[PDB]
Ligand binder design. Sequence first.
Ligand SMILES: *[C@@H]1O[C@H](CO)[C@@H](O[C@H]2O[C@H](CO)[C@@H](O)[C@H](O)[C@H]2NC(C)=O)[C@H](O)[C@H]1NC(C)=O
Lengths: 49, 51, 132, 123
Amino acid sequence: IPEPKSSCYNTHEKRIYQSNMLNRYLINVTFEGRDLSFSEDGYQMHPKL
Amino acid sequence: DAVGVVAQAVHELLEKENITDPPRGCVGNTNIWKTGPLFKRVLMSSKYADG
Amino acid sequence: IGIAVILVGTSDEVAIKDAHEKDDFHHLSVVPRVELVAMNETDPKSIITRICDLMSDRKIQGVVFADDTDQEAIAQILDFISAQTLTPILGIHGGSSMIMADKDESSMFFQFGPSIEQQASVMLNIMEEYDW
Amino acid sequence: KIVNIGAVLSTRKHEQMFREAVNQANKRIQLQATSVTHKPNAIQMALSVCEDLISSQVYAILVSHPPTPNDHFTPTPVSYTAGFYRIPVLGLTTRMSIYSDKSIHLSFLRTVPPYSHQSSVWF
Ligand SMILES: *[C@@H]1O[C@H](CO)[C@@H](O[C@H]2O[C@H](CO)[C@@H](O)[C@H](O)[C@H]2NC(C)=O)[C@H](O)[C@H]1NC(C)=O
């Protein structure tokens, strides 16, 4: 699991790490019974209106 | 060119000049300055022909 | 990991009472350590100041946030913020989320609300089921 | 009540260019001229634009680009800040089309037509 960035601005001089594929999975997560699969393009799926 | 635009904008700003300030300072004045969009319409409506 | 619920100048001490919940399951949940730092109705500069300071205060590996404001800009501000350290952000109580069309290339941010296509879809369903 | 304005470049002599500008301005109250800097890791760039221009009474800001060929989002970190409170600003160098929308940015006012429009010349 990754680690917190040392700085919001100064870590940039040393921000040398892997490429995070978070959304490749983070979009797709659901628990507590209610399903919350997300969308790639940046919003929800099955929104309650 | 751009400073000529802002020049043409300024002496037209006196026609309304109800801005009373562009809010400065960091904290506290969290409100959209009530003439931002209007002054922007003014500035983008600046007509000169020599730059 | 470090998670916080920042509060921008509201009468929502309901949040102060909120986070007392229970869904402990056999998942990773390695370090769920919530944080509740409210603020006054402040400016984006101080907003980001506290944002990445508190991010750097104890720990941060994922952020949530809500506020009470009109639909103006706070989401866009947070959106840029999301980029500069590769971190997820989930705006909620969408006075802080009137969704934006475009997104930066590699920003892990998301927000709630409907996609405009979905609004079209629902309004068409309404138009449908009453036969005009 | 004299208007104040800040720009970003290394030809800081453009400040004297702004003095000639107010000359030709009153010729065509007064207008003052201010200036700011640039730094990498544009996080603090927002901090700097705040601390250096929101300190005074801004009315419009100027930023060209860095000739460093990154040029992808180098103008953004200020298009947002004064976008809050909606203080208009002026664009100089970059020519991508993203910065044109009225819904994502209320700040850009573009001096150089962006690559999009050049389609019509083919038509
Ligand atoms: C998205 O996640 C779902 C599960 O949340 C994936 O679905 C499949 O695998 C699950 C593993 O337990 C099963 O429970 C699901 O039933 C199964 N889906 C179907 C239709 O049977 C799904 O593959 C994931 N997809 C992507 C693109 O990430």
